[PDB]
Symmetry: C3
Subunit: 645 residues, 3 copies
């Protein structure tokens, strides 16, 4: 019963040095594994990992559960909730579970059915620090000590490109000059190289201005450079955890493994339908393929019976392994996809605005079976969301909600509270847009964007980005630039001692499951505003990654053109929306928080840019100059026309 | 993959023409069935219907699920909730699910066990339109296209009697002159006649004044006339949906059916106990009947064993079919009920006020095993509920809550959030009362009424109406008139090519299950304030319906007498309640938002009617005139008595 | 169908007489059992008890469910919640369920598996009365009439020591002079003596001052005296219920009993391992014992197979009965505990402050495997919780939250809303502290205390008390005195016609399960601030109880010493905390509700005691007098030093 420590020294040169200190042996001694992670001995996150004794063999998936508990006392604050007790998880808490779960899930031995829970509690937070990345490491650390079939440690780091330097674990203060904010997690291979496993990045609300003022825009080259910059830190973080584990990790336990199917089922099934299956997979038609792809299942589920009775699940599971094998192989050799597309072909696109009546703005975006409806709502800033969490953010001007109803995929199910993925995809698409939004002063409105995943089969979050851009422009939001997104995939298998890679454009839901890496990129025509990535591959050639990002860029540009046809410049602000033209009695009669702010056009009406094609009509007592849909600008009278203009 | 449309033209003559446009093929293509319904191309409701592949054979009831999703952007509003995202369903959403579920549920083939879900989303709403009825049609439309064993289309319409005309799909503007608001849904029979299936109606807060000013009160004759007025519209709505289905409906699928019992069980059971059963059912006594009615189950469940082992459920299920058959038959032939009452006899009534201590007002209403406790609470108007939904209503002065605890029926179970039926019954009883409440000015208090279903077996919502009237009067609420309700039933079977009908007064919970129609009527001595109805019958003779309504009226009048004995005129306003007598320093000392508004009697005290038997004591600096318990009236001094009166 | 009554006359002499009236037969006639309990015909509580027909044989515990429903109309109030409808249970409601459940649960026959639910509804409440104890009796009454294998009635009473007299059912008015508030519940034995079964007591926020002004401090002697004072009342309450049951109780039904194991399993298991088990239990070492204690289970679970196949559960259940038998026996004879401690030995203690960075105050308390982390947060009074329940309390200055995460015991599980025990333990530890807190005026801050049960195995609520004291002092809260708690146990078995008792100090979780009584005591060095007790014993010798309380006192004093070493006097108030030094323009610039109230130290700074070692630095325009960390005191200048002091 002794306390052990280890440190990961983070050297940011001119920006200073900071340390991630790991501790174990003092707190929560009843957990399978426990560790504390401090950022400069100031911010503290405790992580406890536990495992249920009995496996849930009933499930066909590894049951991992990650929970992030924000304790408001870590900020010296008493919860503002009515009951003065922290309750339902904030966005940050949920997004952090995702950041931890993504790289930790695939790190456990396959077939594991025991419930593994990881609880990270934020106990102290310096208001200038970001706890998410401190928590990733603490999560990995406690799990690594738990004596479970887990291949860690996993090192997590945030690198932001601040003034030309990729700073590790930047502070909120340092992020004010960041053109790109990127979280990365990975492991250290037996040969010392770092394998990146997870990436969640974004451009910022500062990017455009900073690039204007001289900084380098976050293009694919820059972003890829950032990924390399994160590796040394991840190695340092991993080495520190390994030193802790070396001193106090429990010995790996003996856990039951649950296979999806035995060999006799696969050999049987393979021998029974392999030919018909590999053939059916060559049908470039939807209903035709699925049809023959059905005859086969039949010829199989009928040829293996009654020999294999009560093993039906193994049959369909083996049917999946075989299909996957066949589909992957065809991509590497024939470079043809399960739907007949080439490795860089995008699915049938359809963009459109004015899809719903009355709403301030709306757009419909379809790509294959993915159909997203985006709807925009503009209100007074008083409607902006108010937050009281561990984040320094207290108000949110741009709000995105992503709904994924069951019938989106022809299913029945609960319709209500948003899942963790609905929060995850919603965030990415929200973050992909934020970089191009006008400022509070240029556009004094709270903006709520809702993406309805009416149809789903091909990256709805990315489709959501395209729908947001158009919907917003349709509503009159003076975006600095349109943003589009694309979901990519990567197949990789070694053909006789040689590894080949094939990057896939706009991957189907199936190609995600059969791929070795899936990454999503969104951005304007100039730079990347968002990037998400996941993979278990032991690193990939720089030439390959860069090639994948470039391919993704191309797709993104093509889409931006299609979107451009739908709408280019912002449309006029809906009459049904509010205006804040600058120029009790009538404040409660004319209806408007009189600088005038009306909740309807027929108010303030019957200097601030009241309208900006051949100039800018700035409000006065308005004027015209041969600003946005609400921007501010010092006005001076140059000439009074005959009519009095 | 093409978009199809159809239109139902609603002609309201002088009030104008409007259209319900149906669309399909553009949105939510992954759902079994999908359709959009627009009201004048302005208000839009999307409906997606899906079916789970696997039947839930475990259940003994068809698992239908209807969800209504109000999107605040349909109103150009950002949710006011703390999280700025619509969450827990508003009353309207829930009540709308009920309106859709009621006529759609019985339209599916019996024995269906597949989960069928219908999700209606309100995407755009003209603030002058009511979306509920647009949603009923959209729900029916998407389901009709889903390729399910569903006998639609179902047409839903709201007809309100405005200035002598039954206007279809009235607007909030047009409803200001409505004396009756009635929703009706039905189907079109093979012969072209419309079969009404569901009715949810109510008198309004305008009725009394409008009738005063000349309009015709909504009596049974008027109401029945409205029902006929809804038929042509329902035919138009059905024809439009049928035209859509004709163009794009999927072909009916082959679904598994799950019988409650096989013939061998019924023949066996019938042969085994039919005589004893038909005899036991003649026992007019409660415990006696249930006793012999138990000997029989035994003689049965003992005579069919061990022959029928493992089919026990079929036995009791068949035991139900047989009992139902016997009970129904006896009503038609003998006109005697399972409890010994005649077709028009009301159960033992008991009314009483002052049932609970301290509360501002209370009443206890018993009818057979139905026992309702109503409790009244009066507070300042600041306590009136504030709403921010798709409804134009923003504040609710009269609030009704209906609780149905498990022990109400001798059961254990969850005690917490109110079920959809608790909301449904609560609404009806709330709507049955609203028409007779005094106005804000006549009575400046927020009124909360709670009905506790302490005992249940005979229409608790109607019993709730009677309990509300008395409780309110007990509290001093100057109701314009007392309201009473009654639950009716209708048995109908054809005796050799000839159909007979028998209307039942104050039906027991059992007679509801064995009946062919169940309708509830509530109202004052002069008119109907509420009506609810459900049936699968292919329409009934006008003479029969009118007869049923008249019978119901009679019962209602009898009850009003019994209630009158309990209390006639309002009682004095509880001292423990607030007063708003009209006549910082002492505003925060004497305690009262000083026009004076006290939260207790000992405030404002130690022109507005301060008390009104031989006149009206209007506040002054009070006076007496040889108004309600708070009404306003211009006061003038006529004579100063010797004592100074 | 007749209404029956009974009365329990509560005679408080000079304080008056009150009555608890029981009623049955009028309301909720469908429940298995129903009764109303009125306090002076003013406060009313209705209780309905029901039983599910089918036993839940799957469960290994009696499924009792108690629900308390606060109806705001009982207070003539409309719920202030947004939906104007009472929702999630208040603290009082939950704590009341606990008070009712604790004595009612063990009163049912063992092996009972039918779901028994008790719903108590507060329908009317005199604002000067406390409904909790009225509800305990109503709960017992309705259950006693339900015809269940229940050994009631259970009488519940609150006795508070007011001016030297133990007043039964004191009012909020009378409690203003109470030095101790104690709830007690018990039953009447066949011989007429009262057996106390449950106790939930606390000192008050008035204690210290009242003792200062002359009253007698609530020491173990005083407290024990109170327990005797509650007996006559409990007998009166029981007799009244018995009179009601005599008149209307249903006859006891025939319910299925589910044994944990049959005799053949115990005889088999006993014969198979008794020797090795009794021996393994002599191992004073943790891992060593549990190890041998494992060999035994094996030698057993291997010697009874395959003879006992499919009865494994009975084996482990019998293994428990045997272990319990052995452990209890050893305590009585050898006076040695399953962990090797003597009957009065405390587990290894460890106290420490400054355990977490940044937080205003924190402390870590360990006792054996029990590890509690307490964290303190100080904010402006505006952050104090606001309540709108049936309690007269409307604001709460001191808030305690107790978290018990799953990994606290090496388990996985839900992490979110607090269980009823988390509320129960949190309350006790909250109530144990309240008596020593400074007043609003002496300390103008809202105080939130959070106890994290990071490790659990030995009364975490009591460990929570010790952690609170230290954490609070660490934060600078001028407590009047430090408070410590201890969990005790009592083993009692009669050795040949003679009953022996053995009181256990700081019992392990196991000794609680094997004991016959478990009570927790907390308090300062001078008196008891909290006491909790539970037992089924037919009363115990006064000499024994007093001995147990004295032993507990000793332990408590020892702990207070250990805590004293960690911290004695309050530490300086964290700079990161707010100050309210007494001395729009700068009110919104300097940041502080200007009497000055800053949310940070660098505000008000760059008469009220600004700091109080050699005197008290009271704010002025400050001064020094050779008060607390915010107290108020009239300041006068006596002498101006050369430097100007």
């Amino acid at each position: 019963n002794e306390t052990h420590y280890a440190e990961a020294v983070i050297d940011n040169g001119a920006f200073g040095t900071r340390t991630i200190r790991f501790e174990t042996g003092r707190l929560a001694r009843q957990a399978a594994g426990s560790a504390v992670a401090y950022l400069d001995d100031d911010t503290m996150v405790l992580s406890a990992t536990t495992a249920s004794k009995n496996p849930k063999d009933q499930l066909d998936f590894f049951p991992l559960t990650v929970d992030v508990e924000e304790r408001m006392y870590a900020a010296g604050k008493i919860p503002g909730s009515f009951f003065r007790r922290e309750g339902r998880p904030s966005e940050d808490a949920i997004l952090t579970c995702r950041l931890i779960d993504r790289p930790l899930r695939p790190s456990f031995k396959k077939g594991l059915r025991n419930e593994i829970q990881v609880v990270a509690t934020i106990m102290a937070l310096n208001p200038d620090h970001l706890y998410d990345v401190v928590a990733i490491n603490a999560a990995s650390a406690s799990t690594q000590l738990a004596g479970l079939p887990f291949s860690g440690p996993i090192g997590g780091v945030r690198v932001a490109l601040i003034r030309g330097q990729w700073v590790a674990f930047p502070t909120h203060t340092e992020l004010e000059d960041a053109v790109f904010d990127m979280v990365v997690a990975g492991r250290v291979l037996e040969d010392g190289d770092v394998a990146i496993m997870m990436v969640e990045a974004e451009a910022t609300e500062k990017t455009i201005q900073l690039v204007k003022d001289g900084a380098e825009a976050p293009t694919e080259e820059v972003v890829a450079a950032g990924l390399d910059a994160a590796k040394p830190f991840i190695k340092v973080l991993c080495k520190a955890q390994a030193d802790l584990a070396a001193k106090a990790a429990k010995p790996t336990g003996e856990f039951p493994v649950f296979l999806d199917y035995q060999d006799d089922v696969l050999e049987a099934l393979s021998a029974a339908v392999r030919p018909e299956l590999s053939a059916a997979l060559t049908i470039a038609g939807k209903q035709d393929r699925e049809a023959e792809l059905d005859r086969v299942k039949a010829l199989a589920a009928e040829k293996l019976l009654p020999e294999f009775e009560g093993r039906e699940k193994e049959i369909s599971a083996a049917y999946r392994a075989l299909t996957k094998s066949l589909v992957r192989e065809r991509v590497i050799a024939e470079k043809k996809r399960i739907d007949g597309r080439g490795v860089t072909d995008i699915r049938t696109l359809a963009a459109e605005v004015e899809a719903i009546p009355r709403v301030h703005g709306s757009a419909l975006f379809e790509r294959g079976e993915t159909q997203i409806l985006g709807v925009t709502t503009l209100n007074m800033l008083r409607m902006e969301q108010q937050l009281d969490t561990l984040s320094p953010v207290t108000r949110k001007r741009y709000m995105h909600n992503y709904n994924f109803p069951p019938y989106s995929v022809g299913e029945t199910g609960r319709v209500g509270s948003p899942k963790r993925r609905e929060i995850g995809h919603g965030a990415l698409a929200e973050r992909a847009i934020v970089p191009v939004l006008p400022t509070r002063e240029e556009f004094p409105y709270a903006i709520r964007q809702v993406s309805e995943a009416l149809g789903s089969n091909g990256s709805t979050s990315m489709g959501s980005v395209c729908a947001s851009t158009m919907s917003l422009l349709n509503a009159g939001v003076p975006l600095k630039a349109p943003v589009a997104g694309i979901a990519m995939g990567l197949i990789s298998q070694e053909i006789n001692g040689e590894t080949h890679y094939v990057a896939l454009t706009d991957i189907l839901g199936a190609e995600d499951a059969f791929g070795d890496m899936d990454f999503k990129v969104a951005g304007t025509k100039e730079f990347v505003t968002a990037l998400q990535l996941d993979t278990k591959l032991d690193g990939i050639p720089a030439s390959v990654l860069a090639a994948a990002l470039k391919q993704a860029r191309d797709a993104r540009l093509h889409i931006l053109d299609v979107m451009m046809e739908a709408i280019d410049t912002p449309d006029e602000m809906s009459p049904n929306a509010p205006r804040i033209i600058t120029v009790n009695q009538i404040q409660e009669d004319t209806g408007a928080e009189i600088y005038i702010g009306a909740a309807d056009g027929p108010a303030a009406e019957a200097g601030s840019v009241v309208k900006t094609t051949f100039g800018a009509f700035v409000s006065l007592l308005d004027g015209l100059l041969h600003l946005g849909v609400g921007q501010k600008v010092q006005v001076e009278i140059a000439e009074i026309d005959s009519r009095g203009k």
